[PDB]
Amino acid sequence: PLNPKPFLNGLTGKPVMVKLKWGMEYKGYLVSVDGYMNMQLANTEEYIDGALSGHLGEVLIRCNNVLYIRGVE
């Protein structure tokens, strides 16, 4: 059984896609995550309505906005 906390640590340093509750998606390397599940992404790409809207660089995503996170590949 693989729990949310171990799963998230296992994504650390890896490319991820974070889908927000509001529908936008963010693709980047997961630099770090904290106990609240705030996330820091690098090389961040923002997608809106399925299309790339911009390259954002380094971003902080506040925990309560996340719908899901998954590894790319």
Partner 1 sequence: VMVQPINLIFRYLQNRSRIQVWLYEQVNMRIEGCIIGFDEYMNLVLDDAEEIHSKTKSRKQLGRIMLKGDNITLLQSV
Partner 2 sequence: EEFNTGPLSVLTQSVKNNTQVLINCRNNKKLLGRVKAFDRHCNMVLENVKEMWTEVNKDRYISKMFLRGDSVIVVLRNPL
User: End-to-end alpha-carbon separation of the chain, Å?
Assistant: 21
What's the rounded Cα separation, in Å, for the pair 69 and 56?
18
Binding partner of 1, given partner 1, partner 2, none, CB within 5-8 angstroms per partner class: partner 1
Smallest gap from Cβ 46 to partner 2, in A, equals 8
Smaller CB separation from partner 1, 2 or 51? 2
Binding partner of 8, given partner 1, partner 2, none, CB within 5-8 angstroms per partner class: partner 1
Binding site residues, partner 2, CB under 8 A: 20, 22, 26, 31-34, 36, 38-40, 56-62, 64-65
